[PDB]
Design a protein around this ligand. Structure first.
Ligand SMILES: *OP(=O)(O)OC[C@H]1O[C@@H](n2cnc3c(N)ncnc32)[C@H](O)[C@@H]1O
Ligand SMILES: [Zn+2]
Length: 586
DNA sequence: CATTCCGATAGTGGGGTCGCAATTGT
DNA sequence: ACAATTGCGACCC
DNA sequence: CACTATCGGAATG
């Protein structure tokens, strides 16, 4: 309610104060994640009132600004994923889905783009002025990388054409072309520097640098592919049309973007790009096919993790060979026992591969895999290690059978492989230390209670030393007790207590998900949350009423019902609430 | 309607690099 | 008593 | 980030 001038000055005062403490204490940086935040808030208010900007304002920073801790930025519009298709048939299925859905909106035109291989970045432009830039994070909240993005030559600090909207969030890929990647490695080996493994991870590392001066020396570039929040302007209903407009604003846009009228045209485009792939000058992992019309785009809507109007049409992945040195079994929070191949380290498409999931016992039999076997490996989708097949012809004289454990490798309990099901799991329950660990690990994960600083190691030790038994115990911990832990310390322990405290404020959906109810993942957690609104109506629901919730049948209904039916869980929840955990009432 | 098909999730798995701070070295 | 290493978790794909 | 099993619900005969 306080006037503009009074708001500007209160932001500048806090900013100039942080800079003061920085110099005084002779600090290495500004440990306050609230310095980058305040700065973007000042920029947002300033671009809004270009006449209320002073030459003394921190926004007119004359030279290198003081280093500051990374802050976060919320995405009004989610930065989701893409459903993948790997072959012409997979695409035709996608095409059928889009068609069968739409009601005689017949004219479906496909906008086709290269799927660049770097990292996603969202850039907010207010009245044509670049105010902030953020990564994707969990889709809702991402890291503020404004300082690093400002050093990217290809990204204009201000747009220029006509009808520039009041608010325009530009989404695209930041990346290192091959020549830039090689230039950086040539410099690393010349000096004592460390060389990067590939351009994707090098580009990402560059944007996580605390000191922008270092980022400025990385020849990062950018390409627009979409839009986030949009307010004002006169943008067209065609996706291509919009990119064409961005290009006119001065934003960088790939000249390869094309329009296809049929599925055959899309396929032709796919093979065309596959052929010129080596002449691009940068890496790609495929092409993105999307409904060009923003209207139809809205009719198709999104699913949990991705739009229904687009797919990433990926290229086949580069294969390599190596051998299995061993197969280990890891226990998950729901008791699941997953086999993992330990491989002889081999380089594949830019990275060192040492491990690959084997999924389950059926997969191991399908492959006929034995310890010692030679295998064909590949980074599926150009990211994840996958064991394609065993090379029988080269099976060593001496190989060892892979024996699925009949007793959990942790608590020793019996393993259960239910009739007709493929998954085998540990039956120890609360007795199993691996389940306890994985469960607490899941409770603390980014899409759950999001407790920064709590990882596999700290959790392992807390469960090992019997300090924690249930989620509630996590908040009873004090700096004193944490300080005396392996790889733990005074400030380190304080950061955890702080993160735990901050984690108290959540949402019903995240809390529900954090509880780890069988078959209740993030999507179902949100559905149940939105349906009942309160933890009361939920645990008071019957199996028959639970089945009224969309996408919830008897399996889920029963698991949910049996979960709250247990006093055990009732007190875990009640204790968490007692501990302080809470969320916005509907 | 009984089966089969399929869209959408759940659950569990991988590697690179950087900042912070625990830990080791001068 | 700082300075240089390096374990761990964040957080990219 | 990818894969597979599984669940819920739509499609098939
Ligand atoms: O499945 P996923 O999470 O890897 O995919 C989402 C990411 O795909 C990238 N990308 C690259 N090119 C495009 C185009 N042209 N359109 C939409 N997305 C694109 C993004 O970086 C995104 O996060
Ligand atoms: Zn066990």
């Amino acid at each position: 309610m306080e006037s503009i001038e009074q708001q500007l000055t209160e932001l500048r005062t806090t900013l100039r104060h942080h800079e003061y403490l920085y110099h005084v204490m002779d600090a290495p940086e500004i440990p306050d994640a609230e310095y980058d935040r305040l700065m973007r808030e000042l920029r947002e208010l300033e671009t809004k009132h270009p006449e209320l900007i002073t030459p003394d304002s921190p926004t007119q920073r004359v030279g290198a600004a003081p280093l500051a801790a990374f802050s976060q930025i919320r995405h009004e519009v989610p930065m989701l994923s893409l459903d993948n298709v790997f072959d012409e048939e997979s695409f035709l299925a996608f095409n059928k889905r889009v068609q069968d859905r739409l009601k005689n909106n017949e004219k479906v035109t496909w906008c086709c783009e290269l799927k660049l291989d770097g990292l996603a970045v969202s850039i907010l432009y207010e009245n044509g002025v670049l105010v902030s830039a953020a990564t994707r994070g969990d889709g809702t909240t991402g890291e503020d990388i404004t300082s690093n993005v400002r050093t990217i030559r290809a990204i204009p600090l201000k747009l220029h054409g006509e009808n520039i909207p009041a608010r325009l969030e530009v989404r695209g890929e930041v990346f290192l072309p091959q020549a830039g990647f090689e230039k950086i490695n040539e410099d690393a080996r010349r000096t004592g520097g460390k060389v990067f493994a590939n351009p994707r991870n090098a580009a990402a590392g560059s944007l996580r640098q605390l000191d922008p001066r270092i980022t400025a020396k990385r020849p990062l570039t950018f390409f627009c592919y979409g839009v986030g929040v949009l307010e004002g302007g006169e943008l067209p209903d065609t996706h291509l049309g919009r990119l064409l407009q961005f290009k006119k604003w001065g934003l960088p846009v790939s000249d390869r973007v094309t329009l296809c009228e049929s599925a055959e045209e899309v396929l032709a485009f796919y093979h065309k790009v596959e052929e010129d792939r080596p002449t691009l000058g940068f890496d790609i992992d495929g092409v993105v096919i999307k409904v060009n019309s923003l209207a139809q785009q809205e009719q198709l809507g999104f699913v949990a993790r991705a739009p229904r109007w687009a797919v990433a049409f990926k290229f086949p992945a580069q294969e390599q060979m190596t051998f299995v040195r061993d197969v280990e079994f890891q226990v998950g929070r729901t008791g699941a026992i997953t086999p993992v191949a330990r491989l002889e380290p081999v380089h594949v498409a830019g990275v060192l591969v040492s491990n690959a999931t084997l999924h389950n016992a059926d997969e191991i039999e399908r492959l006929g895999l034995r310890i010692g076997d030679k295998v064909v490996i590949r980074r599926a989708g150009d990211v994840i290690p996958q064991v394609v097949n065993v090379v029988l012809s080269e099976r060593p004289e001496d190989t060892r059978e892979v024996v699925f454990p009949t007793h959990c490798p942790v608590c020793g309990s019996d393993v259960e492989r239910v009739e007709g099901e493929a998954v085998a799991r540990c039956t120890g329950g609360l007795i199993c230390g691996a389940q306890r660990k994985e469960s607490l690990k899941h409770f603390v994960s980014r899409r759950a209670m999001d407790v920064d600083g709590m990882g596999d190691k700290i959790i392992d030790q807390l469960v090992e030393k019997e300090y924690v038994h249930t989620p509630a115990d996590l908040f009873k911990l004090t700096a004193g007790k944490l300080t005396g832990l392996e790889r733990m310390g005074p400030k380190s322990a304080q950061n955890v207590v702080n993160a735990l405290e901050k984690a108290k404020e959540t949402t019903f959906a995240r809390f529900l998900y954090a509880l780890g109810i069988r078959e209740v993942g993030e999507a179902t957690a949100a559905g149940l949350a939105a349906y009942f609104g309160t933890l009361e109506a939920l645990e008071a629901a019957s199996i028959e009423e639970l089945q009224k919730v969309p996408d919830v049948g008897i399996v889920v209904a029963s698991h949910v019902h049996n979960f709250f039916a247990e006093e055990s869980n009732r007190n875990v929840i009640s204790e968490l609430l007692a501990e302080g955990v809470h969320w916005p009432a509907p």
